[PDB]
Amino acid sequence: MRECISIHVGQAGVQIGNACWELYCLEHGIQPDGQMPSDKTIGGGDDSFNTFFSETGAGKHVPRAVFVDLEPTVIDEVRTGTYRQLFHPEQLITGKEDAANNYARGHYTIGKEIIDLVLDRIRKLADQCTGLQGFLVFHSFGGGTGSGFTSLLMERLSVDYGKKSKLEFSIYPAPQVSTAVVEPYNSILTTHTTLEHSDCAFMVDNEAIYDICRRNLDIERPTYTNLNRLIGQIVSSITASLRFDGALNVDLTEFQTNLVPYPRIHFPLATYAPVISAEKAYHEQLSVAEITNACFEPANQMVKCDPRHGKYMACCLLYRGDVVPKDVNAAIATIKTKRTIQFVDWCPTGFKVGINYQPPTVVPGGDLAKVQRAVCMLSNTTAIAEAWARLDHKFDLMYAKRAFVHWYVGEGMEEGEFSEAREDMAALEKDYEEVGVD
Amino acid sequence: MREIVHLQIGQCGNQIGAKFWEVISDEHGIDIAGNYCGNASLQLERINVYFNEAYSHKYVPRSILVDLEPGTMDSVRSSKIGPLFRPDNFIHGNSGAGNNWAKGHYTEGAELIENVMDVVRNECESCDCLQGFQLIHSLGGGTGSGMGTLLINKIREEYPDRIMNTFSVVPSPKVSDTVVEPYNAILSIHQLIENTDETFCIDNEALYDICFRTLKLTNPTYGDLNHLVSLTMSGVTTSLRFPGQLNADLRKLAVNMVPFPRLHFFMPGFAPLTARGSQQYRALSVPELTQQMFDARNMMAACDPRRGRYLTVACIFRGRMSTREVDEQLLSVQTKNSSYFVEWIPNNVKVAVCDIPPRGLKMAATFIGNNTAIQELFIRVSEQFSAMFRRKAFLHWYTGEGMDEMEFSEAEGNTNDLVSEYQQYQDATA
Ligand SMILES: COc1ccc(C[C@@H]2NC(=O)/C=C/C[C@@H]([C@H](C)[C@H]3O[C@@H]3c3ccccc3)OC(=O)[C@H](CC(C)C)OC(=O)C(C)(C)CNC2=O)cc1Cl
Numbered sequence: 001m002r003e004c005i006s007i008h009v010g011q012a013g014v015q016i017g018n019a020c021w022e023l024y025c026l027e028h029g030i031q032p033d034g035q036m037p038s039d040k041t042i043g044g045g046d047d048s049f050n051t052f053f054s055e056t057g058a059g060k061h062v063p064r065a066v067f068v069d070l071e072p073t074v075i076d077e078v079r080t081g082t083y084r085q086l087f088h089p090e091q092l093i094t095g096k097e098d099a100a101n102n103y104a105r106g107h108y109t110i111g112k113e114i115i116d117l118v119l120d121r122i123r124k125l126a127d128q129c130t131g132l133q134g135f136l137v138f139h140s141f142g143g144g145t146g147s148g149f150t151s152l153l154m155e156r157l158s159v160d161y162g163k164k165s166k167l168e169f170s171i172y173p174a175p176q177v178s179t180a181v182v183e184p185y186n187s188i189l190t191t192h193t194t195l196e197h198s199d200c201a202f203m204v205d206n207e208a209i210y211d212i213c214r215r216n217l218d219i220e221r222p223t224y225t226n227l228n229r230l231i232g233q234i235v236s237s238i239t240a241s242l243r244f245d246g247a248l249n250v251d252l253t254e255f256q257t258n259l260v261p262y263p264r265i266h267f268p269l270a271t272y273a274p275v276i277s278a279e280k281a282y283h284e285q286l287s288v289a290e291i292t293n294a295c296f297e298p299a300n301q302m303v304k305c306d307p308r309h310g311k312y313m314a315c316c317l318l319y320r321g322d323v324v325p326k327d328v329n330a331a332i333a334t335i336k337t338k339r340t341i342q343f344v345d346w347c348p349t350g351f352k353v354g355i356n357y358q359p360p361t362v363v364p365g366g367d368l369a370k371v372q373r374a375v376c377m378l379s380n381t382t383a384i385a386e387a388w389a390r391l392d393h394k395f396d397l398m399y400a401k402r403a404f405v406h407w408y409v410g411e412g413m414e415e416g417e418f419s420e421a422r423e424d425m426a427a428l429e430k431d432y433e434e435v436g437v438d
Numbered sequence: 439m440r441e442i443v444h445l446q447i448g449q450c451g452n453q454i455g456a457k458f459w460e461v462i463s464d465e466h467g468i469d470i471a472g473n474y475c476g477n478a479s480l481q482l483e484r485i486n487v488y489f490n491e492a493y494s495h496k497y498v499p500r501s502i503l504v505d506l507e508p509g510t511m512d513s514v515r516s517s518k519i520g521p522l523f524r525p526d527n528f529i530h531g532n533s534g535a536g537n538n539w540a541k542g543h544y545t546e547g548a549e550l551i552e553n554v555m556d557v558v559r560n561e562c563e564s565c566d567c568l569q570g571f572q573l574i575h576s577l578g579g580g581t582g583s584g585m586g587t588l589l590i591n592k593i594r595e596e597y598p599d600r601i602m603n604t605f606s607v608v609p610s611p612k613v614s615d616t617v618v619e620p621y622n623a624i625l626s627i628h629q630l631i632e633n634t635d636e637t638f639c640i641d642n643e644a645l646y647d648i649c650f651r652t653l654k655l656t657n658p659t660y661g662d663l664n665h666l667v668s669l670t671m672s673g674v675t676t677s678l679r680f681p682g683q684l685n686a687d688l689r690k691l692a693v694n695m696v697p698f699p700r701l702h703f704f705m706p707g708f709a710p711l712t713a714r715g716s717q718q719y720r721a722l723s724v725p726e727l728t729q730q731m732f733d734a735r736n737m738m739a740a741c742d743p744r745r746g747r748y749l750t751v752a753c754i755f756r757g758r759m760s761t762r763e764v765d766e767q768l769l770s771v772q773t774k775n776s777s778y779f780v781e782w783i784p785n786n787v788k789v790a791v792c793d794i795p796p797r798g799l800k801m802a803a804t805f806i807g808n809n810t811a812i813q814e815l816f817i818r819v820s821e822q823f824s825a826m827f828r829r830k831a832f833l834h835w836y837t838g839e840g841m842d843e844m845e846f847s848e849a850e851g852n853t854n855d856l857v858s859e860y861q862q863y864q865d866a867t868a
C-alpha cells in the first residue's frame with residue numbers, strides 16, 4: 001500500500017545509495033543474491049520492507065532503485081560489486097559523456113539526451129507499484145550530473161507525478177574533498193530549480209561528515225569509503241521509521257507534515273549521537289540522556305551550522321535499539337530545562353519521540369562500531385540559513401567578476417538565470433530570517 | 439408529532455454522541471435492546487423526537503454516525519451501544535481527512551455527501567413531521583469540521599424550512615497538539631455563522647479547565663471530557679425530550695434564545711458537575727445550584743460571563759425541587775445582579791423545572807445562555823488563526839485541495855465581524 005522509488009543521480013548519489021542499499025539488506029537480513037532466510041517463509045509482500053524491496057516470483061528481493069549517471073564508472077562499480085545480481089541491469093543507467101561539473105551540461109545539453117530513458121525506467125518501476133508514495137532522490141549539490149540532471153528529473157517528476165511527494169538526500173559541497181571550483185554555482189542553481197519540486201530535502205555536507213570521521217573514527221585521511229559508510233548509516237536510520245513498524249514518520253506525507261511548515265522551508269537537520277570507532281567498542285556504554293544531549297550537541301550534526309543561534313520548528317527523535325521509553329521523557333525534560341532550544345511562537349508540540357526496537361546494524365569491516373542504543377534527531381531549524389548564506393557568499397564572490405559563467409552560457413543556459421537563482425536564494429534567506437524574527 | 443434527526447460526524451462527534459445516547463437511554467429507561475424498562479410514563483411521552491419507534495416496541499435512535507474512517511464505527515460497535523444504533527445508518531469512508539478541512543469539505547466530503555444525504559432522505563421520508571437537525575461534531579479535525587459544514591450546507595439546501603442545531607466542539611491547544619486546528623475551527627465557524635440557526639459552543643479548553651481545577655485530575659483523558667459533554671448535552675435537550683412550560687422545541691428555543699441571526703452561539707452549563715464515580719457525595723439544594731449555574735468556573739465555554747451581558751437565558755432545573763424556591767432564587771439572581779443582563783430584552787431569563795433528574799444526581803441545574811462573553815472564545819481562536827496565518831504555515835495543504843487563499847481571509851473577516859457585532863451589542867445601552 002506504500003511504495004518508494006529510490007533514485008541515485010550522480011557519482012555521490014550512486015555511491016551513497018549503494019552503501020545505503022547494502023545497509024538496508026544488512027538491516028533486513030536480505031542475502032546479496034536476493035533471497036531471504038526468515039521473511040521469505042511467507043513469500044508475500046507488504047511486510048513494511050515492500051516499500052523498498054520488491055519481491056519477484058523467485059523470492060529475489062530486488063530493490064526499487066534507479067541508478068543514474070552520465071559516466072559508466074560507478075555504475076560498473078556497482079555492477080561488479082557484491083550486489084551485482086541484486087540490481088536489475090535495466091534500472092542501472094549509464095551514460096557516454098559526463099556533465100563535467102557543469103550544471104548547464106547536465107540540465108540542458110547532456111542530461112536532455114538521456115532524460116527520456118530515465119523517465120521510461122521510472123515509469124516501468126512505478127507500474128509495478130500499486131501504492132506509490134513518491135521518490136527519494138540521492139544526489140549532490142556540487143557536481144554536474146547530480147545538480148543539473150537532478151533538477152531536470154525533478155521538473156519531469158513534478159509534471160508527471162504531481163500527486164506524489166519527492167524527498168531528497170543532497171550532498172552539500174565541502175572544500176576538504178571537492179572535485180571542482182564551480183560547486184557554489186551548481187549548488188545555487190539546483191537549489192533554485194528544485195525549490196518548487198522538492199518536498200523535504202535532507203542536505204548533508206561532507207565537511208561535517210569529515211569532521212565527525214576525523215574526531216570520532218580517528219581517521220585523519222577520511223576517504224570516500226568512510227564518508228559513504230557514515231552517510232549510509234545516517235540515511236539508513238533516517239529511513240528506519242519508514243521501512244519498519246509504525247510509530248511516526250511512516251510515510252512521505254508524514255515526513256512532509258511533521259517537519260515542513262512552508263513549501264520553501266523544507267531542509268531538516270539530522271543529528272546522530274553514537275558515532276564511535278570500532279576500536280572503542282567495549283570501553284563503555286551510552287545512556288539515553290547522554291545520547292539525547294549529543295543529539296543536541298552542535299558538533300554532532302550532519303550540517304556544519306549552529307542551531308542555538310536559530311529557532312527550532314520541529315524535532316522527531318527516532319530511537320533505535322532496546323531503548324526503554326521511560327528515561328526518554330527524563331532526557332526530554334533535561335533538554336527542556338535548557339533554554340538554548342527555543343521554539344517558534346506558535347503551538348510548538350515538541351520532541352516527537354518514536355522508538356524502534358530493532359537494533360542498529362553496522363557494516364562488518366566498517367569503521368563504525370556496533371552499538372545497542374542509537375538515536376536520530378530530525379530537526380527543522382533556521383540554522384540552515386547559515387549554510388545557504390555561505391553558499392550565496394561564495395556565489396557572490398565568484399559572480400562579482402562573472403568568473404566561470406561562459407561554461408554555463410555556452411551550454412544553452414541564459415545569463416539572467418544566475419541572477420534569478422541569486423534572487424531566489426536571497427528570498428529563501430529572507431524567508432528563513434522572517435521565521436527567525438518574531 | 440415532531441422529530442429531530444441526529445447526526446454525528448468525526449471521532450469526537452461519534453464518541454460524544456455515543457456517550458450522549460447512552461445517557462439519554464438511561465434517562466428514558468431504555469436498555470441496549472431497544473425495550474422500555476422505566477417505571478415512569480413521563481419518559482415514554484415525547485420519545486419520538488430522538489428515538490425511532492420500530493415494530494414491537496423497538497426504540498432505535500435516529501442517529502446517523504458519519505466518519506471518513508471505519509475505526510470509530512468499530513469502536514462504537516465494540517461498546518454496548520453498537521447493537522442499539524441502526525446498522526444501516528453507519529457511514530464511513532476509506533481514509534480520514536487527516537486534520538485537513540479542505541480534504542473534508544471539498545474532496546472526501548463531496549464524495550461521501552451523496553451517501554449521507556441518501557441516508558438523511560431515508561430518515562426524512564418516514565417522518566410524520568420533521569422538527570430539525572441536531573449535529574454533534576468537532577471544529578478541530580478534518581472530517582468533523584469539514585464534512586459537518588458541508589452536510590450543514592447540503593441540509594440547508596434540501597430543507598431550508600427546517601431548523602439546524604449544532605453541538606460544535608471548539609478545539610484547544612491544551613488537549614490536542616495539532617497545529618492547524620485554528621484553520622478548521624475558523625473556517626467551520628465562518629460556515630456556522632452563515633448556515634446554522636443554533637450552535638452550542640462546547641470548548642475543550644473549558645472542559646480541560648474544569649477537569650483540571652474542579653475535578654482534580656492530573657491527566658484528563660477524553661473519557662472525562664466526554665462525560666462532561668454527555669452530562670451537559672443530556673441536560674440541554676431535557677426541554678426537547680419532555681413536556682414542560684418552557685418546551686422550547688428547537689424552533690421555539692431558537693425564537694426565544696436568538697435575537698440576531700449571527701449571534702446564535704450558546705454557552706451551556708451544568709451546575710453539579712462531578713467526575714465519574716464521585717457524584718454521590720454532593721449536597722444538592724436550590725440556591726447552591728443557582729449560584730453554581732452562573733459560575734464562570736462551572737460554565738462549559740472558556741469565557742467569563744461577568745465580562746459580558748446575557749442576551750437571553752434558558753435555565754432548566756432537573757430533579758424534585760419546589761418551583762417557588764427556584765423562581766425566587768432566579769429572580770433574586772436577576773435582580774441582585776442586574777448589571778449582567780441586558781435591559782433592552784425584558785424578561786430574558788426563562789425558568790423550567792423537569793421532575794426527572796439525570797441518573798447519579800438527585801438534583802441538577804442545566805443552563806443555556808446566549809451570553810456576550812463567547813466573543814472571548816472567538817477572539818482566542820481567531821488570534822491563534824492569525825498567529826498561524828500571518829506567516830502562512832501549512833497553507834499548502836489547504837490550497838493544494840483547491841481552496842483559494844481568499845477563503846481563509848473571508849473566514850477571518852467573518853469571525854472578526856461577529857466579534858465586532860458581539861462587542862457592539864455589549865456596549866449598547868437602552
Ligand atoms: C512549527 O511547525 C510545526 C509545529 C508542530 C509540528 C508537529 C506536528 N504538527 C503537524 O504535523 C501539523 C500538521 C498539519 C496537517 C495537515 C494540514 C494535513 O493536511 C495534511 C494531510 C496529511 C495526510 C493526509 C491528508 C492531509 O497534518 C496533519 O494533521 C498530520 C496528518 C497525518 C494524520 C498523516 O497529522 C499530524 O499532525 C500528526 C502526525 C498526527 C502529528 N503532527 C504534529 O504533531 C510540526 C511543525 Cl512543521
Ligand SMILES: Nc1nc2c(ncn2[C@@H]2O[C@H](COP(=O)(O)OP(=O)(O)OP(=O)(O)O)[C@@H](O)[C@H]2O)c(=O)[nH]1
Pocket residue numbers: 009010011012015016070071098099100101102140142143144145146147171172173174177178179183206224227228231
Ligand atoms: N559523501 C560522499 N560524497 C561524494 C562522494 N562522491 C562524490 N561526492 C561529492 O560529489 C561532489 C561532486 O559531485 P561528483 O562527484 O563530481 O558527481 P556528479 O554530480 O555526477 O558530477 P559529474 O561526475 O561531473 O557528472 C563532491 O563535492 C563530493 O563532495 C561519495 O562517494 N561520498
Ligand SMILES: Nc1nc2c(ncn2[C@@H]2O[C@H](COP(=O)(O)OP(=O)(O)O)[C@@H](O)[C@H]2O)c(=O)[nH]1
Pocket residue numbers: 447448449450451453454534535536537538576577578579580581582583607609610613614619642645660661663664667
Ligand atoms: N472533547 C473531546 N474532544 C475530542 C475528542 N476526540 C477528539 N476531540 C477533538 O476533536 C478533534 C478531532 O477531530 P476528528 O473527528 O478526529 O477529525 P479527523 O482527524 O479528520 O478524523 C481534535 O481537535 C480533538 O481536539 C473527545 O473525545 N472529546
